[PDB]
Design a protein around this nucleic acid. Structure first.
Ligand SMILES: [K+]
Ligand SMILES: [K+]
Ligand SMILES: [K+]
Ligand SMILES: [K+]
Ligand SMILES: [K+]
Ligand SMILES: [K+]
Ligand SMILES: [K+]
Ligand SMILES: [K+]
Ligand SMILES: [K+]
Ligand SMILES: [K+]
Ligand SMILES: [K+]
Ligand SMILES: [K+]
Ligand SMILES: [K+]
Ligand SMILES: [K+]
Ligand SMILES: [K+]
Ligand SMILES: [K+]
Ligand SMILES: [K+]
Ligand SMILES: [K+]
Ligand SMILES: [K+]
Ligand SMILES: [K+]
Ligand SMILES: [K+]
Ligand SMILES: [K+]
Ligand SMILES: [K+]
Ligand SMILES: [K+]
Ligand SMILES: [K+]
Ligand SMILES: [K+]
Ligand SMILES: [K+]
Ligand SMILES: [K+]
Ligand SMILES: [Mg+2]
Ligand SMILES: [Mg+2]
Ligand SMILES: [Mg+2]
Ligand SMILES: [Mg+2]
Ligand SMILES: [Mg+2]
Ligand SMILES: [Mg+2]
Ligand SMILES: [Mg+2]
Ligand SMILES: [Mg+2]
Ligand SMILES: [Mg+2]
Ligand SMILES: [Mg+2]
Ligand SMILES: [Mg+2]
Ligand SMILES: [Mg+2]
Ligand SMILES: [Mg+2]
Ligand SMILES: [Mg+2]
Ligand SMILES: [Mg+2]
Ligand SMILES: [Mg+2]
Ligand SMILES: [Mg+2]
Ligand SMILES: [Mg+2]
Ligand SMILES: [Mg+2]
Ligand SMILES: [Mg+2]
Ligand SMILES: [Mg+2]
Ligand SMILES: [Mg+2]
Ligand SMILES: [Mg+2]
Ligand SMILES: [Mg+2]
Ligand SMILES: [Mg+2]
Ligand SMILES: [Mg+2]
Ligand SMILES: [Mg+2]
Ligand SMILES: [Mg+2]
Ligand SMILES: [Mg+2]
Ligand SMILES: [Mg+2]
Ligand SMILES: [Mg+2]
Ligand SMILES: [Mg+2]
Ligand SMILES: [Mg+2]
Ligand SMILES: [Mg+2]
Ligand SMILES: [Mg+2]
Ligand SMILES: [Mg+2]
Ligand SMILES: [Mg+2]
Ligand SMILES: [Mg+2]
Ligand SMILES: [Mg+2]
Ligand SMILES: [Mg+2]
Ligand SMILES: [Mg+2]
Ligand SMILES: [Mg+2]
Ligand SMILES: [Mg+2]
Ligand SMILES: [Mg+2]
Ligand SMILES: [Mg+2]
Ligand SMILES: [Mg+2]
Ligand SMILES: [Mg+2]
Ligand SMILES: [Mg+2]
Ligand SMILES: [Mg+2]
Ligand SMILES: [Mg+2]
Ligand SMILES: [Mg+2]
Ligand SMILES: [Mg+2]
Ligand SMILES: [Mg+2]
Ligand SMILES: [Mg+2]
Ligand SMILES: [Mg+2]
Ligand SMILES: [Mg+2]
Ligand SMILES: [Mg+2]
Ligand SMILES: [Mg+2]
Ligand SMILES: [Mg+2]
Ligand SMILES: [Mg+2]
Ligand SMILES: [Mg+2]
Ligand SMILES: [Mg+2]
Ligand SMILES: [Mg+2]
Ligand SMILES: [Mg+2]
Ligand SMILES: [Mg+2]
Ligand SMILES: [Mg+2]
Ligand SMILES: [Mg+2]
Ligand SMILES: [Mg+2]
Ligand SMILES: [Mg+2]
Ligand SMILES: [Mg+2]
Ligand SMILES: [Mg+2]
Ligand SMILES: [Mg+2]
Ligand SMILES: [Mg+2]
Ligand SMILES: [Mg+2]
Ligand SMILES: [Mg+2]
Ligand SMILES: [Mg+2]
Ligand SMILES: [Mg+2]
Ligand SMILES: [Mg+2]
Ligand SMILES: [Mg+2]
Ligand SMILES: [Mg+2]
Ligand SMILES: [Mg+2]
Ligand SMILES: [Mg+2]
Ligand SMILES: [Mg+2]
Ligand SMILES: [Mg+2]
Ligand SMILES: [Mg+2]
Ligand SMILES: [Mg+2]
Ligand SMILES: [Mg+2]
Ligand SMILES: [Mg+2]
Ligand SMILES: [Mg+2]
Ligand SMILES: [Mg+2]
Ligand SMILES: [Mg+2]
Ligand SMILES: [Mg+2]
Ligand SMILES: [Mg+2]
Ligand SMILES: [Mg+2]
Ligand SMILES: [Mg+2]
Ligand SMILES: [Mg+2]
Ligand SMILES: [Mg+2]
Ligand SMILES: [Mg+2]
Ligand SMILES: [Mg+2]
Ligand SMILES: [Mg+2]
Ligand SMILES: [Mg+2]
Ligand SMILES: [Mg+2]
Ligand SMILES: [Mg+2]
Ligand SMILES: [Mg+2]
Ligand SMILES: [Mg+2]
Ligand SMILES: [Mg+2]
Ligand SMILES: [Mg+2]
Ligand SMILES: [Mg+2]
Ligand SMILES: [Mg+2]
Ligand SMILES: [Mg+2]
Ligand SMILES: [Mg+2]
Ligand SMILES: [Mg+2]
Ligand SMILES: [Mg+2]
Ligand SMILES: [Mg+2]
Ligand SMILES: [Mg+2]
Lengths: 96, 71, 95
RNA sequence: AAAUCCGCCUCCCAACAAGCUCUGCGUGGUGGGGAAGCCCGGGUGACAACCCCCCGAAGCCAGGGAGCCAAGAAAAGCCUCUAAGCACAACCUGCGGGAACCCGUACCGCAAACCGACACAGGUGGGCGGGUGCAAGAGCACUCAGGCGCGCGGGAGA
RNA sequence: CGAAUGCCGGCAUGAGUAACGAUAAAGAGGGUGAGAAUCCCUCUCGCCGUAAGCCCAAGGGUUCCUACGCAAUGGUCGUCAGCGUAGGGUUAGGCGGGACCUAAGGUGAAGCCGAAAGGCGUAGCCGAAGGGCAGCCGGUUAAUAUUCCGGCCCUUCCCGCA
RNA sequence: AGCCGGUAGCGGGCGUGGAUCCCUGGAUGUCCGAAUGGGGGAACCCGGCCGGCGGGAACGCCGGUCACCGCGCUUUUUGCGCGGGGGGAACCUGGGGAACUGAAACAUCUCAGUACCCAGAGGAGAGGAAAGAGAAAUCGACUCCCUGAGUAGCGGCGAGCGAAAGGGGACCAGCCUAAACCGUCCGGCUUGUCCGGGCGGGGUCGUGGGGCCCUCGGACACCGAAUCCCCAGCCUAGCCGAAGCUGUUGGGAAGCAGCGCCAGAGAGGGUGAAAGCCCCGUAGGCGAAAGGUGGGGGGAUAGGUGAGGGUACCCGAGUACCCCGUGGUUCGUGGAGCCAUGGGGGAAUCUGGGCGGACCACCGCCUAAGGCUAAGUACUCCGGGUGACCGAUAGCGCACCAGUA
């Protein structure tokens, strides 16, 4: 899709880069201040998982967190027919 | 006119499409020459161009009526 | 219903059209979207006469401001058609 | 992929060519045109003649040629080669008959019709652009053809 | 509401003032007409002529031709007009473009990427004033002609035969 | 009882055998546009296939059909089938997300999750049956209003920002599933009491519930939809609807005068000027074959309900949980928990787990990681009503052929 996980649906979120000058008030620290707050994207740790399923090779773009979910989907094996677009089946219709 | 278009209407109903198809193919010619008599200069006290197109229209729907459920 | 009596609309009535009756060159107003090949057959069945050469052209209507409301006259197409020598489109021979 | 074709090596003949093709020009059956002047755009001049020289292109033959370095589009049309398929097809050549659609075509177009608010001394690409003289020439001066005197005038003469 | 160089509108002042848009230039006779320096005709004069002439393209879109017209438009006048009303007028197998080709570029199955919108992208396709392709001379109309006609001359398809 | 639109005229026609006109449905509907056969400089250009038409093979016309995507079927889609494209005044949720400005400068902060961009939904959308609140052995889904409250707090503790519980009200209903065990169909196979995917059963709870056994006798009596069905009712045209004449002035009466009358109607508009009784209305009553509605009345359908004992089988995963980075909440790192989440590590199934504002015990409240759910609410392109709402420089930009010139 676009920098998203095919398995977890995890997609890049928006977070703030907060620069802080000061000693922590919990350290005799008159206070923490804030010099800047700007926008940044956090990107899911995406990786290629390339598996040979029954006929041909099948390539995923999964979050590294959900990698074994591929190999547990690799378990389900029946319907040894058409093209490398088997994931259509390996996908949600497995999990649904 | 009202009285006989009432007749002329139910008259053309139940009258095979091919002759409905044929009748109008004549009436459109009747209009064709009618346009000429009017165009060539007042050879028409007109009033007929209208109720002939209205005739032609009237037919084509009954042509269409038969062609709705089962021909 | 698509009939020959729908292609041919009215006779073109002008001195220039009349000096066409000398040869087999009769000229009518046709429907603007009608093609030369479907005008040939349109005449051939509307006047029981043989068609030799069809010439067409478009005519844009004129912008006419009838009392400060300005519009356009409908666009016409017309055609001059060659009748096989000898043959005559009789009904058009008046004047 | 396969080709009898292309490419590569080898003998052979040919040959600073011819021939085979292809353009251009000239001639060509024949068809047009055809002044001045004269009488109201039009008659007649007329049965017009239609020929000989000379200058001569930047254009044509054209993929011509020589030099040069900065090293100078693509694809189809076209020829050929074969594969599937099919060889009673299909293609080529020649003669015949029939078929050949859509759109533009008015007029302005260095300008009063385009861009400049204007009938605006501005701006707008391509071709023809005749004659005489002046070294030449698209220069300059006059002038064919054709086109115009710039849509306020009349005087006065500080 | 008198003021905001207020806002919209109407009318003054300047003032019968400056200007009337190239210093290429006019004169006269005759005619039409309510009315003429300005419209038509003739003759004489001046001006452009690698042009101020002629032919295409773009752009403009009926301004072209004819009849009738002068309120307004025209820097004056107008009987004239590019103006008002109405009628007419553009004819193509061969000219241009399309049922041909590709160029930059655009678009884009395969594919890749991007929070979304979307961005890229070999092939293919679109794309022309470049490639390809068969028409030359005259006559005719108030106005169209390599277009209608005259003569000579070619191109494609389809179907036949050899 | 007149009609052939604004609109007369010429030139013709129709209507008590019910025209014009208004309501409902139906038919025709060129080209463009999501535009969808293919192109394309929207409204033009060029095709394949099946049938037709012309003399009809070339040319042309006509009817039909052919975009792409997703999904379910199936023989790997050679096919079929349903669905999706796009528009919409504002309202709605999500995904992104400013600045001027305020801070009498400015950077945290503010303006603000605003303007705006994008995606989706609909007549609403969101949310919604508790891992909830929070001190009363206490409330009980969600949305909205009113209050709580400018309180609690947040804060260069600056400017500023600002809850919730509770209470009163509107409306008011909760329901499916995954998992254990049973059946099964095909599968794969290192054939098996095995694994597994598709289906059917079962079963859905926090005083814990269910499964499989054990005993009990449990019952269809009762319950009953948000799904379908009929109906009243409503919308889309209409209809009936009391009661005055006369005389004067006056161009003209409704004024003035004489004598009357109706009133479930004395709201208003019109009529040559000022009318309850002249016309159009009004109070009061009527009216649907057809299309839409039907939230109300009725009916069916799914669906739903036992007790006790034992067994410990199951009770939603890269999730809970913890740490780093952040958002949300009144919370600006603060003693900072709670709800979200990009990164790392990474469980258990009742003696299991989250929460009661760090953390520990105690005492309590709840059942996370699957899903749907009317009504009360928002808006106003549209129709109608009402006005101490404007009256042509006003009122929408437009009272007039204006998003026009
Ligand atoms: K890998
Ligand atoms: K020759
Ligand atoms: K022309
Ligand atoms: K010219
Ligand atoms: K003055
Ligand atoms: K010259
Ligand atoms: K005038
Ligand atoms: K490209
Ligand atoms: K070209
Ligand atoms: K009736
Ligand atoms: K078609
Ligand atoms: K938003
Ligand atoms: K700021
Ligand atoms: K300030
Ligand atoms: K400042
Ligand atoms: K805020
Ligand atoms: K089930
Ligand atoms: K099993
Ligand atoms: K009342
Ligand atoms: K009244
Ligand atoms: K257990
Ligand atoms: K916090
Ligand atoms: K949690
Ligand atoms: K709590
Ligand atoms: K709780
Ligand atoms: K809902
Ligand atoms: K006014
Ligand atoms: K206005
Ligand atoms: Mg950081
Ligand atoms: Mg910042
Ligand atoms: Mg900021
Ligand atoms: Mg991990
Ligand atoms: Mg890891
Ligand atoms: Mg009728
Ligand atoms: Mg039709
Ligand atoms: Mg044409
Ligand atoms: Mg080879
Ligand atoms: Mg020659
Ligand atoms: Mg002679
Ligand atoms: Mg020589
Ligand atoms: Mg020489
Ligand atoms: Mg040259
Ligand atoms: Mg040259
Ligand atoms: Mg060469
Ligand atoms: Mg050369
Ligand atoms: Mg090609
Ligand atoms: Mg031939
Ligand atoms: Mg011309
Ligand atoms: Mg010039
Ligand atoms: Mg030039
Ligand atoms: Mg001119
Ligand atoms: Mg200017
Ligand atoms: Mg101009
Ligand atoms: Mg102009
Ligand atoms: Mg001028
Ligand atoms: Mg000029
Ligand atoms: Mg120039
Ligand atoms: Mg020369
Ligand atoms: Mg010289
Ligand atoms: Mg020259
Ligand atoms: Mg010269
Ligand atoms: Mg010169
Ligand atoms: Mg001259
Ligand atoms: Mg002048
Ligand atoms: Mg004032
Ligand atoms: Mg004033
Ligand atoms: Mg002033
Ligand atoms: Mg001053
Ligand atoms: Mg002065
Ligand atoms: Mg002076
Ligand atoms: Mg002066
Ligand atoms: Mg006179
Ligand atoms: Mg004069
Ligand atoms: Mg000169
Ligand atoms: Mg000129
Ligand atoms: Mg010309
Ligand atoms: Mg043009
Ligand atoms: Mg113009
Ligand atoms: Mg005009
Ligand atoms: Mg005239
Ligand atoms: Mg004038
Ligand atoms: Mg003229
Ligand atoms: Mg005119
Ligand atoms: Mg030709
Ligand atoms: Mg020819
Ligand atoms: Mg074709
Ligand atoms: Mg092309
Ligand atoms: Mg191409
Ligand atoms: Mg692109
Ligand atoms: Mg060319
Ligand atoms: Mg050509
Ligand atoms: Mg020739
Ligand atoms: Mg010629
Ligand atoms: Mg001309
Ligand atoms: Mg010819
Ligand atoms: Mg009449
Ligand atoms: Mg209807
Ligand atoms: Mg049509
Ligand atoms: Mg398209
Ligand atoms: Mg299309
Ligand atoms: Mg093309
Ligand atoms: Mg066919
Ligand atoms: Mg046939
Ligand atoms: Mg078709
Ligand atoms: Mg079709
Ligand atoms: Mg269709
Ligand atoms: Mg949408
Ligand atoms: Mg869209
Ligand atoms: Mg939609
Ligand atoms: Mg948001
Ligand atoms: Mg989104
Ligand atoms: Mg400030
Ligand atoms: Mg709802
Ligand atoms: Mg309090
Ligand atoms: Mg509040
Ligand atoms: Mg309740
Ligand atoms: Mg099941
Ligand atoms: Mg069940
Ligand atoms: Mg238990
Ligand atoms: Mg009544
Ligand atoms: Mg009454
Ligand atoms: Mg009187
Ligand atoms: Mg009275
Ligand atoms: Mg009084
Ligand atoms: Mg009243
Ligand atoms: Mg009164
Ligand atoms: Mg009522
Ligand atoms: Mg009904
Ligand atoms: Mg009900
Ligand atoms: Mg009910
Ligand atoms: Mg649970
Ligand atoms: Mg925050
Ligand atoms: Mg925080
Ligand atoms: Mg926690
Ligand atoms: Mg805690
Ligand atoms: Mg506590
Ligand atoms: Mg749940
Ligand atoms: Mg929901
Ligand atoms: Mg008022
Ligand atoms: Mg008033
Ligand atoms: Mg106004
Ligand atoms: Mg007024
Ligand atoms: Mg309108």
């Amino acid at each position: 899709m676009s920098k998203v996980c095919e398995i977890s649906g995890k997609r890049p979120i928006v977070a703030n880069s907060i620069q802080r000058r000061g000693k922590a008030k919990r350290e005799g620290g008159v206070g923490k201040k804030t010099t800047g707050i700007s926008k940044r994207r956090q990107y899911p740790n995406l990786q290629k998982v390339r598996v040979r399923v029954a006929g041909q090779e099948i390539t995923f773009r999964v979050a590294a967190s959900h990698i074994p979910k591929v190999y547990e989907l690799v378990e389900r094996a029946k319907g040894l027919k058409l093209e490398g677009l088997s994931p259509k089946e390996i996908k949600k219709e497995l999990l649904k | 006119k009202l009285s006989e278009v009432r007749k002329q209407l139910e008259e053309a109903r139940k009258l095979s499409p091919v002759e409905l198809e044929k009748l109008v193919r004549e009436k459109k010619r009747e209009l064709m020459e009618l346009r000429f008599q009017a165009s060539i200069g007042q050879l028409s006290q007109n009033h007929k161009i209208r109720d002939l197109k209205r005739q032609i229209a009237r037919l084509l729907t009954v042509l269409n009526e038969k062609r709705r459920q089962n021909a | 219903m698509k009939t020959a009596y729908d292609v041919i609309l009215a006779p073109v009535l002008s001195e220039k059209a009349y000096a066409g009756f000398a040869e087999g060159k009769y000229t009518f107003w046709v429907h603007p979207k009608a093609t030369k090949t479907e005008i040939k057959n349109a005449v051939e069945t509307a006047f029981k006469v043989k068609v030799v050469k069809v010439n067409t052209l478009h005519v844009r209507g004129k912008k006419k401001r009838l009392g400060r409301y300005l519009g356009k006259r409908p666009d016409r197409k017309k055609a001059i058609v060659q009748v096989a020598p000898g043959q005559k489109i009789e009904a058009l021979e008046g004047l």
